[PDB]
Design a binder for this molecule. Sequence first.
Ligand SMILES: Cc1ncc(C[n+]2csc(CCO)c2C)c(N)n1
Length: 387
Amino acid sequence: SWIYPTVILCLFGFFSMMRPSEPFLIPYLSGPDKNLTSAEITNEIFPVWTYSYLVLLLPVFVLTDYVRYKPVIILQGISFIITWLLLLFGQGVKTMQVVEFFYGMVTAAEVAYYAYIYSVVSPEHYQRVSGYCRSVTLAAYTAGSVLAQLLVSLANMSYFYLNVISLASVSVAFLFSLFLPMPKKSVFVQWFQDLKECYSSKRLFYWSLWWAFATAGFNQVLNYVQILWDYKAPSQDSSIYNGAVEAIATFGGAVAAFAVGYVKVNWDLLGELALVVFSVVNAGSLFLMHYTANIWACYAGYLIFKSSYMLLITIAVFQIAVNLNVERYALVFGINTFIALVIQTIMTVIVVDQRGLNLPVSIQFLVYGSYFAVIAGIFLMRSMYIT
Ligand SMILES: Cc1ncc(C[n+]2csc(CCO)c2C)c(N)n1
Protein backbone atom coordinates (compact mmCIF):
# COMPACT_ATOMS: atom_id res chain seq x y z
CA SER A 1 0.00 0.00 0.00
CA TRP A 2 1.02 3.60 0.65
CA ILE A 3 3.02 2.72 3.78
CA TYR A 4 6.26 1.56 2.15
CA PRO A 5 6.77 4.40 -0.39
CA THR A 6 5.71 6.98 2.19
CA VAL A 7 8.13 5.57 4.77
CA ILE A 8 11.05 5.40 2.34
CA LEU A 9 10.41 8.90 1.00
CA CYS A 10 9.98 10.28 4.52
CA LEU A 11 13.29 8.73 5.54
CA PHE A 12 14.92 10.27 2.46
CA GLY A 13 13.39 13.69 3.14
CA PHE A 14 14.45 13.51 6.77
CA PHE A 15 18.05 12.41 6.31
CA SER A 16 18.42 14.83 3.39
CA MET A 17 16.97 17.84 5.23
CA MET A 18 18.67 16.94 8.54
CA ARG A 19 21.64 19.26 7.99
CA PRO A 20 23.40 20.54 11.14
CA SER A 21 25.50 22.82 8.92
CA GLU A 22 22.50 24.75 7.57
CA PRO A 23 22.15 27.13 10.57
CA PHE A 24 25.93 27.73 10.54
CA LEU A 25 26.48 28.13 6.80
CA ILE A 26 27.40 31.83 6.98
CA PRO A 27 29.82 31.46 9.95
CA TYR A 28 31.40 28.43 8.25
CA LEU A 29 31.99 30.20 4.94
CA SER A 30 33.37 33.33 6.63
CA GLY A 31 35.56 31.63 9.20
CA PRO A 32 39.05 30.24 9.78
CA ASP A 33 38.70 27.12 7.61
CA LYS A 34 36.78 28.36 4.56
CA ASN A 35 38.34 31.83 4.96
CA LEU A 36 35.98 33.95 2.86
CA THR A 37 34.56 37.44 3.26
CA SER A 38 30.96 38.56 3.59
CA ALA A 39 31.35 40.61 0.40
CA GLU A 40 32.27 37.48 -1.58
CA ILE A 41 29.58 35.30 0.02
CA THR A 42 26.72 37.75 -0.47
CA ASN A 43 27.68 39.20 -3.86
CA GLU A 44 29.68 36.50 -5.68
CA ILE A 45 28.45 33.21 -4.16
CA PHE A 46 24.82 33.48 -3.03
CA PRO A 47 23.26 34.84 -6.28
CA VAL A 48 24.78 31.87 -8.11
CA TRP A 49 22.40 29.72 -6.08
CA THR A 50 19.33 31.63 -7.27
CA TYR A 51 20.49 31.59 -10.89
CA SER A 52 21.15 27.85 -10.72
CA TYR A 53 17.83 27.32 -8.94
CA LEU A 54 15.93 28.95 -11.82
CA VAL A 55 17.97 27.34 -14.61
CA LEU A 56 17.76 23.84 -13.10
CA LEU A 57 14.11 24.30 -12.14
CA LEU A 58 13.33 24.62 -15.83
CA PRO A 59 14.17 20.96 -16.67
CA VAL A 60 12.73 19.82 -13.34
CA PHE A 61 9.24 20.94 -14.27
CA VAL A 62 9.84 20.05 -17.93
CA LEU A 63 11.23 16.52 -17.51
CA THR A 64 10.42 15.11 -14.05
CA ASP A 65 7.11 13.43 -14.92
CA TYR A 66 8.59 11.93 -18.09
CA VAL A 67 11.42 10.25 -16.16
CA ARG A 68 8.94 9.09 -13.49
CA TYR A 69 10.24 11.27 -10.63
CA LYS A 70 12.86 8.81 -9.40
CA PRO A 71 16.05 9.82 -11.27
CA VAL A 72 15.50 13.46 -10.31
CA ILE A 73 15.31 12.38 -6.67
CA ILE A 74 18.46 10.31 -7.20
CA LEU A 75 19.92 13.34 -8.97
CA GLN A 76 19.11 15.37 -5.86
CA GLY A 77 20.83 12.74 -3.74
CA ILE A 78 23.96 12.74 -5.89
CA SER A 79 23.99 16.54 -5.91
CA PHE A 80 23.73 16.36 -2.11
CA ILE A 81 26.98 14.38 -1.86
CA ILE A 82 28.62 16.61 -4.48
CA THR A 83 27.49 19.82 -2.76
CA TRP A 84 28.78 18.87 0.68
CA LEU A 85 31.92 17.15 -0.62
CA LEU A 86 32.82 20.40 -2.40
CA LEU A 87 31.73 22.46 0.61
CA LEU A 88 33.96 20.41 2.92
CA PHE A 89 37.10 20.54 0.75
CA GLY A 90 36.49 23.59 -1.46
CA GLN A 91 38.48 26.81 -1.27
CA GLY A 92 37.97 30.26 -2.72
CA VAL A 93 34.94 31.76 -4.42
CA LYS A 94 35.34 29.59 -7.53
CA THR A 95 34.55 26.31 -5.76
CA MET A 96 31.85 27.86 -3.56
CA GLN A 97 30.01 29.03 -6.68
CA VAL A 98 30.03 25.40 -7.86
CA VAL A 99 28.68 24.46 -4.43
CA GLU A 100 25.86 26.96 -4.97
CA PHE A 101 25.19 25.57 -8.45
CA PHE A 102 24.81 22.06 -7.04
CA TYR A 103 22.65 23.33 -4.18
CA GLY A 104 20.46 24.99 -6.79
CA MET A 105 20.18 21.58 -8.44
CA VAL A 106 19.26 20.13 -5.03
CA THR A 107 16.53 22.70 -4.39
CA ALA A 108 15.23 22.28 -7.94
CA ALA A 109 14.92 18.50 -7.51
CA GLU A 110 13.09 19.07 -4.22
CA VAL A 111 10.07 19.55 -6.52
CA ALA A 112 10.54 16.00 -7.79
CA TYR A 113 10.85 14.83 -4.19
CA TYR A 114 7.50 16.42 -3.35
CA ALA A 115 5.67 15.13 -6.45
CA TYR A 116 7.07 11.57 -6.43
CA ILE A 117 4.88 10.28 -3.61
CA TYR A 118 1.74 11.63 -5.29
CA SER A 119 2.91 9.68 -8.32
CA VAL A 120 3.01 6.45 -6.26
CA VAL A 121 0.03 6.41 -3.88
CA SER A 122 -3.69 6.41 -4.55
CA PRO A 123 -5.57 9.72 -4.26
CA GLU A 124 -7.40 8.63 -1.10
CA HIS A 125 -4.07 8.79 0.76
CA TYR A 126 -3.01 12.07 -0.88
CA GLN A 127 -3.94 14.03 2.25
CA ARG A 128 -1.95 11.87 4.66
CA VAL A 129 0.94 11.69 2.20
CA SER A 130 0.73 15.47 1.92
CA GLY A 131 1.21 16.03 5.63
CA TYR A 132 3.66 13.34 6.71
CA CYS A 133 6.18 13.92 3.91
CA ARG A 134 6.16 17.70 4.30
CA SER A 135 6.09 17.34 8.07
CA VAL A 136 9.14 15.10 8.18
CA THR A 137 11.20 17.59 6.18
CA LEU A 138 10.39 20.33 8.67
CA ALA A 139 11.00 17.85 11.47
CA ALA A 140 14.36 17.08 9.90
CA TYR A 141 15.17 20.78 9.78
CA THR A 142 14.44 21.38 13.44
CA ALA A 143 16.25 18.17 14.35
CA GLY A 144 19.25 19.40 12.42
CA SER A 145 19.04 22.76 14.15
CA VAL A 146 19.02 21.06 17.54
CA LEU A 147 21.77 18.69 16.40
CA ALA A 148 23.74 21.81 15.58
CA GLN A 149 22.87 23.98 18.57
CA LEU A 150 23.51 21.22 21.09
CA LEU A 151 26.82 20.08 19.62
CA VAL A 152 28.40 23.51 19.16
CA SER A 153 27.25 24.30 22.71
CA LEU A 154 28.00 20.93 24.35
CA ALA A 155 30.53 18.97 22.25
CA ASN A 156 32.67 21.92 21.06
CA MET A 157 32.11 20.66 17.51
CA SER A 158 33.57 22.79 14.74
CA TYR A 159 31.56 23.91 11.73
CA PHE A 160 33.69 21.66 9.52
CA TYR A 161 32.56 18.63 11.52
CA LEU A 162 28.99 19.92 11.34
CA ASN A 163 29.35 19.82 7.56
CA VAL A 164 30.88 16.34 7.88
CA ILE A 165 27.78 15.24 9.83
CA SER A 166 25.57 16.87 7.19
CA LEU A 167 27.40 14.96 4.44
CA ALA A 168 26.98 11.73 6.40
CA SER A 169 23.26 12.53 6.73
CA VAL A 170 22.65 13.35 3.06
CA SER A 171 24.57 10.26 1.96
CA VAL A 172 22.16 8.10 3.97
CA ALA A 173 19.35 9.93 2.20
CA PHE A 174 20.96 8.92 -1.10
CA LEU A 175 20.86 5.27 -0.04
CA PHE A 176 17.21 5.65 0.98
CA SER A 177 16.41 7.26 -2.38
CA LEU A 178 18.05 4.30 -4.13
CA PHE A 179 15.38 2.05 -2.58
CA LEU A 180 12.36 4.18 -3.47
CA PRO A 181 9.71 2.21 -5.37
CA MET A 182 9.68 3.20 -9.03
CA PRO A 183 6.40 4.82 -10.14
CA LYS A 184 4.45 3.00 -12.83
CA LYS A 185 4.66 4.20 -16.42
CA SER A 186 2.47 6.98 -17.82
CA VAL A 187 5.95 21.65 -31.50
CA PHE A 188 6.53 23.96 -28.52
CA VAL A 189 2.92 25.20 -28.53
CA GLN A 190 1.58 21.68 -28.02
CA TRP A 191 3.39 21.50 -24.68
CA PHE A 192 1.80 24.80 -23.67
CA GLN A 193 -1.53 23.37 -24.84
CA ASP A 194 -1.01 20.44 -22.48
CA LEU A 195 -0.24 23.02 -19.80
CA LYS A 196 -3.62 24.56 -20.60
CA GLU A 197 -5.14 21.13 -19.97
CA CYS A 198 -3.14 20.80 -16.75
CA TYR A 199 -4.11 24.18 -15.26
CA SER A 200 -7.78 24.00 -16.28
CA SER A 201 -8.41 21.73 -13.29
CA LYS A 202 -10.85 22.74 -10.58
CA ARG A 203 -9.38 25.06 -7.90
CA LEU A 204 -5.86 24.28 -9.16
CA PHE A 205 -5.10 27.68 -10.69
CA TYR A 206 -6.35 29.41 -7.53
CA TRP A 207 -4.27 27.18 -5.26
CA SER A 208 -1.31 27.54 -7.63
CA LEU A 209 -1.81 31.32 -7.66
CA TRP A 210 -1.56 31.26 -3.87
CA TRP A 211 1.51 29.01 -4.12
CA ALA A 212 3.22 31.23 -6.69
CA PHE A 213 2.79 34.36 -4.57
CA ALA A 214 2.63 33.31 -0.91
CA THR A 215 5.81 31.22 -0.96
CA ALA A 216 7.81 34.04 -2.57
CA GLY A 217 6.95 36.24 0.39
CA PHE A 218 7.60 33.32 2.71
CA ASN A 219 11.11 32.89 1.29
CA GLN A 220 11.74 36.64 1.59
CA VAL A 221 10.59 36.57 5.22
CA LEU A 222 12.81 33.57 5.92
CA ASN A 223 15.76 35.41 4.39
CA TYR A 224 15.30 38.65 6.32
CA VAL A 225 13.75 37.50 9.62
CA GLN A 226 17.18 37.08 11.20
CA ILE A 227 18.09 40.62 10.11
CA LEU A 228 14.83 41.87 11.62
CA TRP A 229 15.61 40.05 14.87
CA ASP A 230 19.11 41.53 15.00
CA TYR A 231 17.69 45.02 14.40
CA LYS A 232 14.98 44.58 17.04
CA ALA A 233 17.48 43.58 19.75
CA PRO A 234 21.19 43.65 18.86
CA SER A 235 22.95 41.05 20.99
CA GLN A 236 26.01 38.87 20.44
CA ASP A 237 24.21 35.91 22.06
CA SER A 238 21.43 36.18 19.45
CA SER A 239 23.25 33.54 17.38
CA ILE A 240 22.24 30.96 20.00
CA TYR A 241 18.79 32.55 20.39
CA ASN A 242 17.76 33.26 16.79
CA GLY A 243 18.37 29.87 15.21
CA ALA A 244 16.93 28.09 18.24
CA VAL A 245 13.78 30.17 17.82
CA GLU A 246 13.72 29.17 14.16
CA ALA A 247 13.90 25.55 15.32
CA ILE A 248 10.74 26.19 17.34
CA ALA A 249 9.16 27.91 14.33
CA THR A 250 10.04 25.04 12.00
CA PHE A 251 8.90 22.34 14.43
CA GLY A 252 5.58 24.10 14.90
CA GLY A 253 5.29 24.25 11.13
CA ALA A 254 6.04 20.53 11.11
CA VAL A 255 3.19 20.03 13.56
CA ALA A 256 0.94 22.09 11.30
CA ALA A 257 1.83 19.85 8.37
CA PHE A 258 1.12 16.81 10.54
CA ALA A 259 -2.25 18.40 11.29
CA VAL A 260 -3.17 18.17 7.60
CA GLY A 261 -2.24 14.52 7.20
CA TYR A 262 -3.59 13.22 10.50
CA VAL A 263 -6.76 15.23 11.11
CA LYS A 264 -9.42 13.99 8.68
CA VAL A 265 -11.28 17.07 7.42
CA ASN A 266 -12.88 17.61 4.01
CA TRP A 267 -10.50 20.18 2.54
CA ASP A 268 -12.54 20.51 -0.67
CA LEU A 269 -15.33 22.46 1.05
CA LEU A 270 -12.86 23.97 3.55
CA GLY A 271 -9.98 24.90 1.25
CA GLU A 272 -11.08 28.48 0.60
CA LEU A 273 -12.01 29.17 4.22
CA ALA A 274 -8.69 27.78 5.44
CA LEU A 275 -6.80 29.79 2.81
CA VAL A 276 -8.45 33.09 3.72
CA VAL A 277 -8.25 32.52 7.48
CA PHE A 278 -4.61 31.42 7.54
CA SER A 279 -3.56 34.08 5.02
CA VAL A 280 -5.11 36.66 7.34
CA VAL A 281 -3.13 34.93 10.09
CA ASN A 282 0.06 35.16 8.01
CA ALA A 283 -0.46 38.88 7.40
CA GLY A 284 -1.32 39.55 11.04
CA SER A 285 1.74 37.67 12.26
CA LEU A 286 4.02 39.51 9.83
CA PHE A 287 2.58 42.85 10.93
CA LEU A 288 3.05 41.74 14.55
CA MET A 289 6.70 40.91 13.83
CA HIS A 290 7.39 44.46 12.63
CA TYR A 291 5.02 46.82 14.44
CA THR A 292 5.58 45.50 17.97
CA ALA A 293 9.00 46.41 19.37
CA ASN A 294 9.28 43.28 21.52
CA ILE A 295 11.66 40.46 20.62
CA TRP A 296 9.43 37.80 22.20
CA ALA A 297 6.35 39.15 20.42
CA CYS A 298 8.31 39.06 17.16
CA TYR A 299 9.41 35.49 17.91
CA ALA A 300 5.81 34.43 18.53
CA GLY A 301 4.73 36.20 15.35
CA TYR A 302 7.37 34.37 13.33
CA LEU A 303 6.36 31.04 14.85
CA ILE A 304 2.72 31.73 13.96
CA PHE A 305 3.67 32.86 10.45
CA LYS A 306 5.80 29.80 9.71
CA SER A 307 3.27 27.39 11.23
CA SER A 308 0.30 28.96 9.39
CA TYR A 309 2.21 29.03 6.08
CA MET A 310 3.35 25.42 6.39
CA LEU A 311 -0.20 24.29 7.12
CA LEU A 312 -1.47 26.31 4.15
CA ILE A 313 1.19 24.98 1.77
CA THR A 314 0.45 21.41 2.88
CA ILE A 315 -3.21 22.05 2.06
CA ALA A 316 -2.19 23.64 -1.25
CA VAL A 317 -0.01 20.72 -2.34
CA PHE A 318 -2.70 18.23 -1.31
CA GLN A 319 -5.48 20.09 -3.12
CA ILE A 320 -3.37 20.52 -6.25
CA ALA A 321 -2.54 16.81 -6.20
CA VAL A 322 -6.11 15.53 -5.84
CA ASN A 323 -7.67 18.00 -8.28
CA LEU A 324 -4.90 17.75 -10.90
CA ASN A 325 -6.56 14.93 -12.93
CA VAL A 326 -3.30 14.64 -14.92
CA GLU A 327 -0.19 12.66 -14.01
CA ARG A 328 2.01 15.79 -14.34
CA TYR A 329 2.42 16.43 -10.62
CA ALA A 330 5.93 17.89 -10.84
CA LEU A 331 5.06 20.10 -13.81
CA VAL A 332 2.52 21.97 -11.68
CA PHE A 333 4.70 21.88 -8.57
CA GLY A 334 7.78 22.88 -10.56
CA ILE A 335 5.98 25.69 -12.38
CA ASN A 336 4.57 26.98 -9.09
CA THR A 337 8.05 26.89 -7.56
CA PHE A 338 9.57 28.61 -10.61
CA ILE A 339 6.98 31.40 -10.61
CA ALA A 340 7.45 31.74 -6.85
CA LEU A 341 11.21 32.07 -7.30
CA VAL A 342 10.75 34.64 -10.08
CA ILE A 343 8.39 36.68 -7.90
CA GLN A 344 10.75 36.39 -4.93
CA THR A 345 13.73 37.50 -7.03
CA ILE A 346 11.81 40.49 -8.41
CA MET A 347 10.66 41.47 -4.91
CA THR A 348 14.21 41.08 -3.58
CA VAL A 349 15.49 43.37 -6.34
CA ILE A 350 12.74 45.90 -5.64
CA VAL A 351 12.43 46.18 -1.88
CA VAL A 352 15.77 45.29 -0.26
CA ASP A 353 18.40 45.44 -2.99
CA GLN A 354 20.49 48.58 -3.41
CA ARG A 355 19.40 48.76 -7.06
CA GLY A 356 15.81 49.02 -5.79
CA LEU A 357 14.24 51.06 -3.02
CA ASN A 358 16.84 49.67 -0.56
CA LEU A 359 14.28 49.64 2.24
CA PRO A 360 15.77 48.93 5.69
CA VAL A 361 14.72 45.83 7.59
CA SER A 362 12.34 47.92 9.72
CA ILE A 363 10.14 48.88 6.76
CA GLN A 364 10.91 45.59 5.00
CA PHE A 365 8.60 43.54 7.18
CA LEU A 366 5.84 46.13 7.00
CA VAL A 367 6.13 45.67 3.23
CA TYR A 368 6.06 41.87 3.61
CA GLY A 369 3.04 42.02 5.93
CA SER A 370 1.20 44.29 3.50
CA TYR A 371 2.21 41.92 0.67
CA PHE A 372 0.63 38.99 2.54
CA ALA A 373 -2.39 41.13 3.43
CA VAL A 374 -2.84 41.84 -0.28
CA ILE A 375 -2.67 38.09 -0.91
CA ALA A 376 -5.23 37.43 1.84
CA GLY A 377 -7.61 40.15 0.66
CA ILE A 378 -7.45 39.00 -2.96
CA PHE A 379 -8.40 35.50 -1.80
CA LEU A 380 -10.82 36.93 0.77
CA MET A 381 -12.54 39.08 -1.88
CA ARG A 382 -12.75 36.08 -4.22
CA SER A 383 -14.69 34.16 -1.55
CA MET A 384 -17.13 37.06 -1.17
CA TYR A 385 -17.59 37.25 -4.94
CA ILE A 386 -18.27 33.50 -4.99
CA THR A 387 -20.81 33.89 -2.18
C1 LIG B 1 24.53 25.72 0.70
C2 LIG B 1 23.50 26.80 0.69
N1 LIG B 1 22.44 26.66 1.50
C3 LIG B 1 21.52 27.64 1.48
C4 LIG B 1 21.64 28.76 0.69
C5 LIG B 1 20.59 29.85 0.69
N2 LIG B 1 20.88 30.93 1.64
C6 LIG B 1 21.51 30.71 2.79
S1 LIG B 1 21.43 32.08 3.82
C7 LIG B 1 20.49 32.91 2.63
C8 LIG B 1 19.75 34.18 2.97
C9 LIG B 1 20.62 35.40 2.74
O1 LIG B 1 19.98 36.62 3.01
C10 LIG B 1 20.52 32.26 1.44
C11 LIG B 1 20.22 32.82 0.09
C12 LIG B 1 22.78 28.82 -0.12
N3 LIG B 1 23.00 29.87 -0.93
N4 LIG B 1 23.71 27.85 -0.11
